[model samples]
Target: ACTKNAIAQTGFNKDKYFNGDVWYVTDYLDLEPDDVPKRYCAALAAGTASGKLKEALYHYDPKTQDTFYDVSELQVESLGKYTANFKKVDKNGNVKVAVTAGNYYTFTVMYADDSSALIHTCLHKGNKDLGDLYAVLNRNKDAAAGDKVKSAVSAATLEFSKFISTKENNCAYDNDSLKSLLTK
Candidate 1:
C-alpha cells in the first residue's frame, strides 16, 4: 500500500551517516497499522563492514518485550537512497534467517545531520509490501526532536503529532550488539 517514492537528502554526507554508530528511533510513523506493532522501539547501526556498506537493526516491542535483529548489506541506488537486503540474526551475529527473495527494504535519507536524521523505509516481505515507515532518529535515544528534523517532517507533508514516541516507553538498546552486527 506504500506509494511514496521518498526523495533523498541533497548533499547527504554518507561518511557521517555510516559512521559505525547507533541511531535510536526516537519517534516513528507507520502508515500501515497491521504491518507493524502500534507501539514499538527500534534502532540501527550503519557502517562499512568488510568494505561493504552495512546496517544493523534492533527492534523491540515495549509492550510485549519482544525483540528482533537484522543485518543488511546495502546497495546504493543514489547518494542517500539504497536497496537493502536483510537477514535475521541473533545478537551474537549468528544468522537465524538468511536473506531470501523479497526480504528487503528501500531506504531513503530524507534529512540528516551529525546528531539527528529523518529516514523513510518501505519494507517488502515475500508477497507482502508493508507500507511506508518514517522514523526520526537521534544519536541520543532520549533526545527530543529538534526544529530542523521537524521542519523536514513538514516538508514531507507528514504530521509530527502522528508519530509515536519511543522515549517514554523505557526502550532500551544493546548498543554493542547492534554495532558488532554490522560485520555479520
Candidate 2:
C-alpha cells in the first residue's frame, strides 16, 4: 500500500495561498512492462485553470525518501499507448491538457469534501477504460463512488517545497483566501 501524506502549495513568489491547504501524496510505480503492478496511488489535481489551481499528479516514495512525479519522465501506457504529460498550470488561469488519442480522465470526489475520490479513466462517448488501469486502483474508494464537492479552488497551490524547500508551503504560509486551510 502507498502511504498518503498531506501537501500544500502557495501563491506567486510563495507569498500567498491560492489553492486550499491539502493535496494528496501517494507512492506510484514506474511505468514499465512486467512491473508486477505494485499497489500505489497518484494524486491528480483537476480543473483549477492555472497558477495554484491547475491539475497534476504526484506521489512520494518512502523507499527513496523523495517525491517522484516531477522528476520522472512521462511514458506511454502499455494498453492504450497513452502518455501522461501535458497537464501543467501556469499563472495564466487555464488548464491545457489536450487529448487526441485517448479519453479524458475525470475525478469524482468521494468521501464527501475530502480528497478521497473516484477517478475515472474515460474515453470518447463516456466509455470507461476499465479494460485497463482498474487492477491497480481497486481500492476502497473503488468499491463505491465519492460524493461531489461543489466549491472551486478558483486557483491552485503548487507545492514548491516538494522540489525545493522554499518555505512557500510551510504551515506558517498564510493568506485571507486560504484561511484555516493554511493552518489545517
Candidate 3:
C-alpha cells in the first residue's frame, strides 16, 4: 500500500519526530520522510551492479514523469557488463560486496533511456556510525568542529536526498500515488 501520509495518530509531529535521530540500522520496509536515512544508500559499484546508488534519490517525486525503477530488485546489467559477474543478493538481503567506495541503497532504473533490475539495499551495514567515528576523530575540545563534522554528514545525506528527486526520475512507487520519502 502507498503511504498516504507520514505515520500518525494524534499529537504527533513528523518534523519533531525526525529530529529525535532515533531511526538507525533499521530495515527499509515501512519508510517515511523521517525514516529516510534507512531508505537511501550511496553504494559503491565495484561489486557488479553496485552503481544503482549513483542515480538514486530516496525522496524522488514526480509531476512530470515516466520511466520505472526497482529500488530493491535491481538489474545492474550496465554495471555487470563492465565487471565480470554481477554481485548476488542472498536470501538474507545482504549484497555480497567484494569491493567498496561507499554504501547506499541499491536503486536501478527499470525503463526509459535505461532499464535495470535493482533492489533497495541494507544501509549502513558496515561503518554505519561514520558520523560517530568522525565526531570522535574531529572533535576539537570546542563546538565549531563538532558542528562542521555533523554538517558534513547532513550535507552528504541531504545531497543524496536531492539527487534522485531531480527531473523525470523513476522508481517502483513512482506512479503509485505515494510520496518518495526524503532522507537526512
Q: Which has the greatest lDDT?
A: 1
lDDT (Cα, tens digit) per residue for candidate 1, span 13-36: 999999999999999998986778
The whole-model lDDT of each prediction reads: 0.94, 0.26, 0.23
Model 2 per-residue lDDT at 91: 23
* TM-score for predicted model 1 compared with the true structure: 0.97
Candidate 3, position 83, lDDT: 12
In the range 1-184, model 3's lDDT, one tens digit per residue, is 1221111113323232222121111112222334333223211111112223212112222333322221232233342111112223332223444334333333211110011111222233344412211111111111122343234334333222222211122222221211121110
**How does model 2 score by TM-score?**
0.29
Candidate 3 wrong stretches, greater than 4 Å: 1-30, 37-102, 113-184
Reference-based TM-score of each model = 0.97, 0.29, 0.18
Off by more than 4 A, model 2: 1-22, 25-36, 50-53, 59-100, 123-184
Given candidate 1, what's the lDDT at residue 6?
A: 96
